[PDB]
Design a protein around this motif. Structure first.
Motif: not given
Length: 56
Positions: A3-8, A31-46
Motif C-alpha cells: 500500500y503506497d501513500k497509506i504505508a508511506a 489519520e492519513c492511514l484512515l483517510s488514505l486507505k478509504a481513498e485507496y480501496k483499490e482491490k486488495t484490502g479496501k
C-alpha cells in the motif's frame, strides 16, 4: 500486501513514536492511514489496513 501513500507516511509516524516524537504528528499519521486507505480501496484490502489506523 502493498500500500503506497497509506504505508508511506504510516511508517513515518510509526518510526517517530518509536524514536519518540510528538503525539500531534503520530496521530496525524494514523489519520492519513484512515483517510488514505478509504481513498485507496483499490482491490486488495479496501480501506487498506496500515497499522495505527484511525485515532481519537
Amino acid at each position: 500486501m502493498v500500500y503506497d501513500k497509506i504505508a508511506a507516511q504510516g511508517e513515518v509516524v510509526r518510526k517517530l513514536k518509536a524514536e519518540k516524537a510528538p503525539k500531534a504528528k503520530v496521530t496525524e499519521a494514523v489519520e492519513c492511514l484512515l483517510s488514505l486507505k478509504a481513498e485507496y480501496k483499490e482491490k486488495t484490502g479496501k480501506e487498506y489496513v496500515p497499522g495505527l489506523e484511525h485515532h481519537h
